[PDB]
Amino acid sequence: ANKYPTEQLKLWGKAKELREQYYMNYARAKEKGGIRWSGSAWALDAIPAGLGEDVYSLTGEPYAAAVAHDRKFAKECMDAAEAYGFARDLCSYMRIYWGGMHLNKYAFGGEFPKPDFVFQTQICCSHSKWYQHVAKEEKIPEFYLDVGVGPYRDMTDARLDYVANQLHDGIAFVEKASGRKFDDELFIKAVKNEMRSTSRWADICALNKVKPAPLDEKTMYSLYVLCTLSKSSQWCADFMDELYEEVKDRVARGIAAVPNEAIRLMTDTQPPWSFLKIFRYLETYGAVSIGSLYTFALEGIWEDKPDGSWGGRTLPWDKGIEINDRDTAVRLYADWNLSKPQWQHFYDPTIKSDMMLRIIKEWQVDGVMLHLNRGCEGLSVGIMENRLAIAKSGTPVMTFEGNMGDEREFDEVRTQARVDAFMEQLGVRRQAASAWSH
Amino acid sequence: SDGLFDQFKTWYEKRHDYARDWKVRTGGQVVATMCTYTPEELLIAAGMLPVRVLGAHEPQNVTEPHIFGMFCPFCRDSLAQGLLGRFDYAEGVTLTQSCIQYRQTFGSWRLHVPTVKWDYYVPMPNEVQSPHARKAHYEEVQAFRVFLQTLTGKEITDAMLSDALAVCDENRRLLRELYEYRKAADPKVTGVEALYASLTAQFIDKREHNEMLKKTLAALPNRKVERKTGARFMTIGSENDDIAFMGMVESVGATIVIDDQCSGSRYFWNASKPEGDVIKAIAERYCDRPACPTKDYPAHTRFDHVLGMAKEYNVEGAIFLQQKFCDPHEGDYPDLKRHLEENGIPTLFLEFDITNPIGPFRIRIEAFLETLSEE
Ligand SMILES: CC(C)(COP(=O)(O)OP(=O)(O)OC[C@H]1O[C@@H](n2cnc3c(N)ncnc32)[C@H](O)[C@@H]1OP(=O)(O)O)[C@@H](O)C(=O)NCCC(=O)NCCSC(=O)c1ccccc1
Ligand code: SF4
């Protein structure tokens, strides 16, 4: 079947080890007097990093996704949250997280480790409600950064002021909650590391534009996750640099993630974590998923490049912009995060429609498989308008219903049959095109 | 019987006839508004009629291509009204940011309703508890004023804004005065009558609506009450605009004496503070208003507001009406329920689709009333 050379990733084991160490560090944070905090993967984690090198987060959505990979434990956690009285149609990550806190069990062993404080970003409505319940049940201080200032391309000075001024409140909050003095040098280092890691993850994804794709999306789920754990850490920034070197070498050598690659797919949001085997099934057709706006930009930070293409955002110091003081760092850090592609559709779904159409073009995509994800209001808003814009463009597109965290709303059998039908459709379209353009 | 509230009922039933005729009488534009946070003072100052989009509570099959069915019935029912052409007389559409689901109604409407000539999204801060939110919203309200001045080509002066705020504040004060009558043992205003008044405030010219509120208040001191009060209920939820459902509740042996919902109290509760910078007065009125759950963090200030209303209006039982899939109110529900019950107010939970057979709800209400009879 295999037209292309293929090779397994050399840095795979390190990617798995860094993730395991992150989770073990959170649990062991108190052995040497460290700080623990919890919040979204979208929290501005450089702020707590100004309190020391022994400040360990637990990001809520990646943790809940880890639980969702264990169907039995995920079921138990959701049953506990339901017994408390929460509606079953709330965010499945949030329900899993709540249930595991009530059960007092950590997915990586032991009791559920109590955070010292909540440090959260609010853009999805459930961002507040998730940690309001946690902070009451753990009796801990809580801080929320309201980033709801509308699309980055419409940004005003006052909108940026609102986010920057809240971040200064956040500094005061984490000092009070932890009892430590915030250090400008550690903070600036963390801002710079977050800029590095998020831009570099984008650089790696942009390498997937070539045929054959050096990475498949299932492999990428174990790589994009590191920025969702601690994007402002030195370890994450340095690993993104190492990974970029490996993927560059794969491109240089013509290496394919999928040796029989013939069809390039794009997905969208939050895949069903206990059903990633669907991607291996697609590989039997010679289909590889090259990524998604979700994989590329849940944390990756992007810009338009000199040729009009999409690439990692330029680091300020490569642009003559110095970061030498707290106030400059805070404003640039706010601006960096407000450019996040995966925040724009909370205001205007056509921004995401255009972003998806651009990915289809630049990554040379043959077909799109859209998850209508009942488990996540925040990433699903606007999904049907995105589908319509893709349908109008002429690129084949199918949908399937599911839930990234709650298997009870995902039908494996029906979804696999729809995906099979889609593979047939792509073959038919190829035959018709060949016949017309003989 | 006496028909005192008949004008509000006519305005509700014939809301679209009203707007078309308003355009004939004034020559002004009509703006479809979404979410009660819309700074209507600016629209009124620009010579426009704000009309809140609401659903029709009928079966509809037009929204499936635009909004996925995991989202609430209200956001879909609302969008359907635009797609069906029922707001074809509205040149503008505007939403002020709160719940993310409702943002889809706005986005799909501006893209697909072909009679839309202009649109505007106001990113009002969600964290009204932040010390920086009022400055941010001051600037958002000023920016919308500048947009509207540009759109109409007519300067919107501070005097024009102050007059519009005065009309809105008068409406807010008159609706609060109407609600005060609900505290009596035999309320001269039923929950359905209050609902007709507070909902029509959101799509009738406020000067005309104020005149009708003042006529209503002139009549109340001597209004003969014939019905029995029954149990004193409070209704809680997001929108709660199904008047027909509320009429059933008040037909089984109860009166809805107070509410926590955007068809009612959460829309109008507070007037602006006296203040010489009219943009600050307008922006802060909305930041200081009882908060949508989405805007209620880090503290659940809503819980104190709901319990306070329940005690001040002598509530005996609280009914949560929840739209299917409503994340902001679902997130608050278990602890708000506990807060009311721990303070002596039994509660009932009812969940709603776009349409629902009324019978099963009536049985649940009748059973709740029996529980109030006990302990
Ligand atoms: C740990 C899982 C879940 C599973 O990992 P898996 O890889 O499936 O399983 P295993 O670990 O057991 O390993 C077995 C596999 O290793 C493969 N293999 C072996 N050697 C190599 C090699 N050298 N190279 C390449 N591959 C190699 C081998 O083929 C085998 O695969 P197969 O059996 O053939 O198919 C991983 O996907 C993950 O971390 N996902 C991220 C979850 C998460 O936290 N996401 C963030 C959510 S945040 C969010 O949503 C959000 C945030 C904010 C706002 C809103 C939303
Ligand atoms: S619904 Fe989605 S975006 Fe919102 S809290 Fe859950 S995971 Fe985050």
Q: Which residues touch B181 (CB under 8 Å, ≥6 apart)?
A: B187, B188, B189, B220
Distance CA A436, CA B9 (A): 63
Half-sphere exposure in the Cβ direction for B64 (13 Å, CA): 3
Q: How many whole angstroms separate alpha carbon A40 and alpha carbon A61?
A: 6
A236 marked as part of a ligand binding site: no
Q: In whole angstroms, what is the distance from residue A94 CA to residue A376 CA? A: 9
The span from the first CA to the last CA of chain A, in angstroms, equals: 25
Query: Which residue, A228, A217, A216, is CA-closest to A258?
Result: A216
Cβ neighbours of residue B132 closer than 8 Å, sequence gap 6 or more: A161, A162, A165, A166, A169, B125
Pick the residue whose CA is nearest to atom 4 on ligand 2: A378
Between chains, do A169 and B132 touch, taking CB under 8 Å as contact?
yes
Are A381 and B101 within 8 A, CB to CB? yes
Residue A39 lies in a domain: yes
Mutate to test the pocket of ligand 2, among A40, A42, A126 (most ligand atoms within 8 A of CB): A126
Contact A400, A267 (CB under 8 A): no
Residue A137 forms contact with B (CB below 8 Å) = no
What type of residue sits at position A71?
R
On whether residue A189 sits in a domain, the answer given is: yes
Is some CB atom of chain B closer than 8 A to the CB atom of A126? yes
Instruction: Using a CB–CB cutoff of 8 Å, tell me whether A382 touches chain B.
Output: yes
DSSP-assigned beta bridge partners for residue B255: B232
A93 CA → ligand 2 middle, Å: 7
In a domain, A80, yes or no: yes
Structure's resolution in angstroms: 1.4
Atom of ligand 1 nearest to the CA of A279: 35
Cα of A231 vs centre of ligand 2, distance in Å, is 19
- E strand or H helix at A49, and its extent? helix A46-49
Residues of B in contact with A402 (CB under 8 A): none
Taking Cα atoms as reference points, which of A247, A258, A274 lies closest to residue A96? Answer: A274
| Strands in A12-105 per DSSP E | 35-39, 55-59
Regarding the beta carbon of A380 and ligand 1, being less than 6 Å apart is answered: no
Q: Residue A325 burial (CB < 10 Å; 0-12/13-18/19+)?
A: exposed
The amino acid at A190 = A
- B319 to chain A, closest Cα gap in Å: 16
Q: Which residues of chain A make contact with B133, given a CB cutoff of 8 A?
A: 146, 162
Please provide the DSSP assignment of A188-237 as one string: HHHHHHHHHHHHHHHHHHHGGGSSSPS--HHHHHTTTHHHHHHTTSHHHH
Residue among A130, A156, A372 whose CB faces B68 most closely? A372
Do the annotations mark residue A376 as ligand-binding?
yes
User: Exposure of A252 by Cβ count < 10 A (0-12 exposed, 13-18 middle, 19+ buried)?
Assistant: exposed
| Substitution site in A57, A91, A123, A221 for ligand 1 pocket (most atoms within 8 Å of beta carbon) | A221
**CA B111 to ligand 1 center in whole angstroms:** 38
Number of folded domains in chain A? 1
CATH number of residue B83's parent domain = 3.40.50.11900
By CB atoms closer than 10 A (0-12, 13-18, 19+), residue B94 is buried
Q: Pick from B246, B244, B227, B243: which is nearest to B235 by CA?
A: B246
Q: What is the DSSP string of B40-83?
A: HHHHHHTT-EEEE-----S---SSTTTS-TTS-HHHHHHHHHHH
Q: Which of B200, B203, B197, B206 lies closest to B176, judged by CA?
A: B197
* Nearest-atom index, ligand 1, CA of A273: 3
Nearest-neighbour CA in chain B from A71: distance (Å): 22
User: Looking up tokens 């930041």, which residue turns up?
Assistant: B287
The response to whether residue A39 sits with its C-beta less than 6 Å from ligand 1 reads no
Q: Do B328 and A129 touch (CB under 8 A)?
A: yes
Neighbours of A342 (CB within 10 A): 20
E strand or H helix at B12: helix B6-13
Q: Note whether residue A425 is domain-resident.
A: yes
A124 touches chain B (CB under 8 A): yes
C-alpha–C-alpha distance, residues A205 and A311, integer Å: 8
In testing the pocket of ligand 1, which one of A14, A69, A91, A274 has its CB within 8 Å of the most ligand atoms? Answer: A69
Rounded to the nearest 5°, which phi and psi values hold at B352? -125, 140
Q: Is A22 in the pocket of ligand 1 (CB under 6 A)?
A: no
Does B121 contact A133 at a Cβ distance shorter than 8 Å? no
A380 in a structural domain = yes
Q: What is the DSSP letter of A98?
A: H
Tell me how far apart the alpha carbons of residues A91 and A97 are, in angstroms, rounded to a whole number.
10
- Residue length of chain A: 438
Alpha helices in A215-299 (DSSP H): 217-221, 225-230, 234-252, 277-283, 293-297
Beta strands in A281-436 (DSSP E): 287-289, 302-304, 310-312, 367-373, 397-402
Kindly give, in sequence order, each residue whose CB lies less than 8 Å from that of residue B1, ignoring residues fewer than 6 positions away.
B226
Q: Which residues contact B226 (CB under 8 A, 6 or more apart)?
A: B1
User: Which residues have a Cβ under 8 Å from the Cβ of B357 and sit 6 or more positions away?
Assistant: none
Whether B103 has its CB under 8 Å from any CB of chain A: the answer is: yes
Please name the residue whose Cα sits nearest to atom 6 of ligand 2.
A91
Query: Taking CB atoms and an 8 Å limit, are B300 and A132 in contact across chains?
Result: yes
Sheet containing B118-122: which strands, arranged edge to edge? B49-52, B30-34, B92-96, B118-122
Chain centre to alpha carbon of residue A1? 33
Whether A1 is in a domain gets the answer no
Q: Residue A225: nearest ligand to its CA?
A: 1
Task: Tell whether A148 lies on the interface with B, counting CB pairs under 8 A.
Answer: yes
* CB neighbour burial string for B156-172, b if at least 16 within 10 angstroms, e if fewer: beeebbbebbebbbbbb
A361 contact partners, CB below 8 Å, separation of at least 6: none
In chain A, % helix, strand, coil (3-state, to 5) comes to 55, 10, 35
Cα–Cα–Cα angle for B118, B121, B123, rounded to 5 degrees: 160
How far away, in angstroms, is A88 Cα from ligand 2 center? 14
User: A4 lies in a domain?
Assistant: no
CB A279 within 8 A of CB A369: no
Give the number of C-alpha atoms closer than 13 A to the C-alpha of residue B158, restricted to the C-beta side.
7
Tokens of A403: 């839930």
The ligand whose atoms approach the alpha carbon of B99 most closely is 2
Cis peptide before A212 (omega within 30 of 0): yes
- Nearest alpha carbon to residue B298 among A223, A68, A146, A286: A146
B 126-155 residues inside an 8 A Cβ radius of A? 126-127, 130-133, 135-136, 139-140, 143
Dist CA B320 CA B309 (whole Å): 15
The answer to whether residue A5 is domain-embedded is no
Domain extent at residue A144: 12-436
Interface check for B70 against chain A (CB to CB < 8 A): the answer is yes
Nearest chain B CA: its distance from A106 CA (Å): 23
Count of structural domains, chain B:
1
The CB of A292 under 6 Å from ligand 1? The reply is no
Question: Does any CB of chain B come closer than 8 Å to the CB of residue A91?
Answer: yes
Q: What is the largest CA-CA distance in chain A?
A: 73
Q: Which domain holds residue B343?
A: 1-375
Find out whether B138 and B124 touch, Cβ atoms under 8 Å.
Answer: no
Rounded to a whole number of angstroms, the distance from the CA of B356 to the nearest CA of chain A is 19
The answer to whether the CB of B167 falls within 8 A of the CB of B206 is yes
Rounded to whole angstroms, how far apart are CA atoms B206 and B199?
12
Neighbouring-strand partners of residue B33: B52, B94
Q: Which 249-288 residues of chain B touch chain A by CB within 8 A?
A: none
| Beta-carbon count within 10 A of A331 CB | 18
Beta strands in B79-230 (DSSP E): 92-96, 118-122
Report how far ligand 1's centroid is from the alpha carbon of A273 (Å): 9
B124: left (phi over 0), alpha (psi -120 to 50) or beta: beta
Q: Residue B372: enclosing H or E segment and its boundaries?
A: helix B358-373
Residues of A in contact with B66 (CB under 8 A): 384-385, 388
- CA A69–ligand 1 middle distance (angstroms): 9
Residue B202, classed as helix, strand or coil, is: coil
Instruction: Provide residues with CB under 6 Å of ligand 2.
Output: A 61, 91, 93-94, 124, 126-127, 130, 376-379
Distance in angstroms (rounded) separating the CA atoms of residues B125 and B85:
32
